[PDB]
Design a protein around this ligand. Sequence first.
Ligand SMILES: [Zn+2]
Lengths: 87, 142
Amino acid sequence: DALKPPSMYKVILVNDDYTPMEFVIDVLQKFFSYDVERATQLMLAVHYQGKAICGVFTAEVAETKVAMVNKYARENEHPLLCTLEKA
Amino acid sequence: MLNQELELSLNMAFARAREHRHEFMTVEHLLLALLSNPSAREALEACSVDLVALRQELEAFIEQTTPVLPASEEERDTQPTLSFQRVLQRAVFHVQSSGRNEVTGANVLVAIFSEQESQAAYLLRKHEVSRLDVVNFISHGT
Ligand SMILES: [Zn+2]
């Protein structure tokens, strides 16, 4: 037999044409604890690269952060999409 | 109904997590708390698990991987992970699906095995405990 630890996951913010830059920064500060400056740099990366990694967490934590972000986007009526993928 | 000892375990796990300012109460906090829940503890001893080593592996993983809320942030507090919620719901489901109602720490332990990407399930299998090991113990004793 062979057994490995579950893997770590990248949590990603995807770009869209409707979500205001201000909300993206809000999400980065509120859910990932970035200061305004780093938050702003990540927001631009999402804008130019089309996506950006907000953090790397265990599978369990990553899944929860993703659901929290998507619920907050939904409540504020923005199609901001948060996703995860194996680190 | 979650029995009294299980409920004591859950509320203290949650209080401990809040005191450490953790953003999340995880399935690992849950397993760590079950180490001293009579029902789950008995099952684990019956599987010859080194509870000292498991406790340590759980505590290390928890403090190293659980984000801490900023001393600043007082508008949001400790939340259970989705995985944690599924485990409690699965434990209730397993018990009800057998026609019973009392949920013990051992039923919660059984449900942890279904969170395959959890560190908790990993650690349990690392200590050679299978879901069926716990179910046999619950059904047939040592
Ligand atoms: Zn802690």
